[model samples]
Target: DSSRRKWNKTGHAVRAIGRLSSKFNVYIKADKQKNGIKANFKIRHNIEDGGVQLAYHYQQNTPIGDGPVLLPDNHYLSVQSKLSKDPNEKRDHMVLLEFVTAAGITLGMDESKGEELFTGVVPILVELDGDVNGHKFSVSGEGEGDATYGKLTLKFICTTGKLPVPWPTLVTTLVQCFSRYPDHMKQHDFFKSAMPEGYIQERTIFFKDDGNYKTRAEVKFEGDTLVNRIELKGIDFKEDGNILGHKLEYNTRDQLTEEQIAEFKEAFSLFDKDGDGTITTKELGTVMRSLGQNPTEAELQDMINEVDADGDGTIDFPEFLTMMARKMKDTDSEEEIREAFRVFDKDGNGYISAAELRHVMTNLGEKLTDEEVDEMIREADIDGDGQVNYEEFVQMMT
Candidate 1:
């Protein structure tokens, strides 16, 4: 029964872009090729909030294999080009493929050369092509080549669709933008070159199960990075959804690196004063009090309810990671405004002329009028120069 199956064709290019955490990104794209899918992949990371850094990338215009390949793991529905080797064995270029299921998918690479580091997850059935051996891999810690090509660490921002966005397609969008960047992509260039049309941000207010209170968040884009500034939400607040919100430190997935695990252990010990495996709601209140923040019983209950994945009303080590001590990068004000200004500049020059503004805005699916243009220019073109410059544009946006 396993031998009788057919590979599905991708009608169009499929992509997924998501953060592995606040520190790493997994971007993948698969397009239908003559025999297999041609994938254009790249991942980005923020090293202490530098503008749009490239952490890893797969080559373009290459196919991973000649025909549909089988995944060695039978759980996934389809297999793509692999980038790892099966350890505890031996051979030259010992490439292997065989399996497919629908729940989830994984990949392996040829470890004989380059660096043997390949990891990711996908819920779709698209396939990737190309021998990653010939292609360079970042974070792969072996071989004699570019030093940056082998260590897999970094995070990405920029996603497909809207808020409440799924990680799968979010990562795909990041890959699409990453491929468009040249070796010398700057913070300003990251958007026009990556997500030209830009992304949508959510103005969200999430309430606790009861009517106690909640926090407000507004998401935005500075190139491919996601910046969310969060703050207290006033019960009678009246702000649009496009406002910037809080700083969120995203949690790592099921797999915890040794360093992360150690950090969690320390946090657990402090919270677990009774030496029990769980931190009770009262203990959580004490922990918050240590930081000089008092919580209402409802608020304390809310905290416990949030991270306590199980309905036990208590937080455990594994569940605690989901609650605290995460990391996030702030969006640069200059970079954010600059990328926005470029949206109207179109020609890449330092100035945005009337014609360019009209052209660019039209491409955004809304044609502008001469009257509307004049109004914006009157306000944004502070020097009355008839065109918008970076400074004026920034003033207009901010």
Candidate 2:
């Protein structure tokens, strides 16, 4: 307690201005493909009233050709502004131009394919240095296809915010102008489309609750806004587990005990020589050999394939636990079973009577009905005895 008295102070300054106007050009095209497309937009920030005004003009002309064409020919724009605290170190003024309604018009090669409309959003960002000269400016952004194409580049240039600069100077200094071949867009779309189809393919069943029964909903995005519609009606619902020809069990891990889980984790760690949380074929073979098992390469591969449910050719922890549960069918030891029996035999008796079973079933874990308790005792009592002896209990467990 030398000197407990201390004083601290802070200050903040606020400034307001009348108005600032700026304009920029937007270039949207892939390298070598559709290079002539361009758009111009203007921005006016009214600092006094804290309001912004924006205007945009866009148009395109497609030369008749056999190659693909991006269309709608026009795009809508919405603007958002942001300011930075350290204007000198970074661009202080910035704006984001959001394309409201952008879609690609494509005529499919086949009749069944027909004319498909690919919708997407484009976000163009423009920045200006806060210095009086405002010579440091940049334009960069990207466009995405709703559910089809992957990504497209959208570049920009500040035309009226600062001193007159050569187009090439701004292009090279800010964003590089690169060419994307016509085939690039097609390849991106094809690859992206396949991924979503794979997701829908793997999930055979779509589930809905009672409240959502017979309800159909479709959602689409316009710019940053989400538009969705829902319709409800009576519809048939059917399911046949046998149709898949496999038994589906949920939460098998819930059946594992704490001690058994700990043991399994240790075993998995031992098998995972690389300790990367997964057991590869090589690691599995190394561990198997260490454990005095000489399994062939084919045998090791089969073992991994059996448990690699995701088909990644490696066994992760969850998959390892599942395999362990299957192999170690008798998860409980004799001592553990005896301890569980002691819980039901509350009076330290060698057998469990109906009264004790009822008490334990009602007071411990999940409650069971009197009828269920009686049925359980009846099944465990192999000698027609009213009580469950140690032998009968162990037999029931096995």
Candidate 3:
């Protein structure tokens, strides 16, 4: 029905979790776009009651074998549901969208009228509600209008049952640009290449092996290029529930799930004693304790300082979400500290020596005396072996 370019290859896998649910997904890869080959994802759905299944045909045809259907263009995505009919049937069905873009972009949507219109610089994610059980909801998108930079892929799920089926996890990975031999790259006599030469900053976010989880790579930038050096600009979750790096993913206009927003509303209402739509500094300690969280007065102040975007010595609903999201992200940041250890363990010897530490410090633009380096090691060398091991590194960083 519809065809574009052929992909280089296609692969599929079945991921299952007895506790939740499972399904089949496919990946198509292409070195170049031509002959109906395009880099794409093939998401499958059940056509019958687990009796008949149809993996979408990218070409819009029902193929005999299991294969992915070509993805519809991002701009063509939209949804129709009961929520569209009347305001009363709001939560009967749901529609959502997931997209990719750089850190600077902002996305805005206005459905105040009947038409769904979007404004702003980039398309990130969308969640809408429909009234009926079998409401038609669609999502996914091209990474950009040009379609050839970062990984821009989307998948939206809908169910006929009550409430949305599941929470879709949207992830963006900042790929660490690696240095390649410049001469070797120049030898290619291909049609054309946009591969980074001296430096290239690019990231590709793909569905992980599990088929449902989304993850991204974050890196420190030397210029426009990102490198292996980790910079904790926000929260990141790896495949195995590892929270690497210690930073809150900060975006003032960041999107949240329907449930998350509702939680925030309930949370703010509890502490806004005067109903002034703000939580004062004095009330923070009481609220934290009420929630069974023991935060010292100084700790509460630190939180207010970090998220009090209005400089009002208190937090509003928006800032409260920022605070809760940041706090929610710090669950066991040991993986990040371990990665830091791995970085300093240049030789892969599983330990950090004084010399290696010196190299890292110098590269980080810090001048360290031999005496100072020894003292740093001494402070973290729990085994007294004159080298910093994983445990010591974790201790020092965490």
Candidate 4:
């Protein structure tokens, strides 16, 4: 191994002190671990206050270092480690870790209130706000604070320092300077472009055969230009799953029967932990495990990653419901699912509304107030703001 030039030069490499330290200290707790550690990640849930709260727990069994080093950022020190013992076990941990960070940045951490760990370790967090790294980030368009929607910011304030760090003065300085820093980034064009580029679009190539052949081309401007997105669908391109159709043939909540409605209600209950409109991926997976049948661990995680849209790393009701419906559609005929939508469209209203949604959900046997229904509607609407447009409503009803 000494023959390897990269290791020989500086002998400096990132080592995960998780499994390595475990050998010496069997009693060592999670907090004692280091950065870059290869560990097993697991998720669980408990019924608290008659409602479910998903708890995700991860640990590194065979990590990189014999001891953990200090990764200090803002009043916190995190130890990232790699597995030190078995290679096979190490592969499992490493492979899972890749999936954990597959799509976008991960939001939550294992620590009870350990978000503070990211600041002192990750460095992207200028200060502690809520979740890991105190990385509070939000997205919005030009009229960031205007008519239709405004001032959308996702704040991750890491309070109650979980890790040890140098001093408050230094952290404050870093925050003042790099507070606006982005821990994760997409291309500037990506942000403004109508469609996602790279793998998202490329991977979508096969979707054309499914009836969604989309045609797209872009031309750059030497000077500033206004419109950028250009798309030719249905005619030039094809539409799969009615992907490009202006008027999608969808049913409202009213069309579903009582039995079908009941099935959906129970499914929704399992996901709506805390009876809130949002259900974290952990909670959603519990329901999905039984939706069709028990899901293998890999499939469960995959569903979570794909469905937890917005990438907050949590699957709210809107995301989870559509995912569940999509999964159902994968098995059931499109017409059958549309019938269920008729039930969701309660009140015989051509369209569905928060007020009308209660009927299909009451199939759970508990009548919900219109007020509660409104809250649920807002939750699925995304944007953190209340209001579901037609497309958003269809997404939920489905």
Leading candidate by lDDT: 2
Q: What is the TM-score of each candidate against the true structure?
A: 0.25, 0.22, 0.28, 0.28
Better of 2 and 4 by lDDT: 2
Candidate 2 similarity to native, TM-score: 0.22
Compare the candidates by TM-score and give the number of the best one: 3
* Candidate 2 per-residue C-alpha lDDT over 1-398 given as tens digits, one digit per residue, 9 for 90 to 100: 10000000000000000000011223233222542233333322121222222222232322222334233232222222122122352322222212221212122121201112233432323232211122233333232323222232333334344322222211111210111112313332211221211101000112221110122222223354322222222222223221121122211123788866665565565556577988777886764443234668876765665554445567788866655443211332444455556766778778889888677544322246777667777877878878889888776544
Lowest lDDT 10-residue stretch of candidate 4: 10-19
After superposition on all CA atoms, how large is the RMSD of candidate 1? Answer: 27.1
Writing each residue's lDDT as its tens digit, candidate 3 over 232-298 gives 1212233232111112111123357786566456546555656788776666665444323466776
lDDT of 1 by residue, 69-149 (tens): 211121111111123343653321112221211211211111101011111221111111111112211110111111122
lDDT of 4 by residue, 198-286 (tens): 10110011222222212232222113221112222312223322222212211112234555444444445545657866555556455
Question: How far does residue 27 in candidate 1 sit from its true spot (Å)?
Answer: 25
Stretch of 10 with least lDDT, candidate 1: 6-15
Give me candidate 4's TM-score against the actual structure.
0.28
Reference-based lDDT, each prediction: 0.33, 0.36, 0.34, 0.28
Off by over 4 Å in 2: 1-215, 232-261, 270-277, 282-398
The number of clashing residue pairs in model 3 is 19
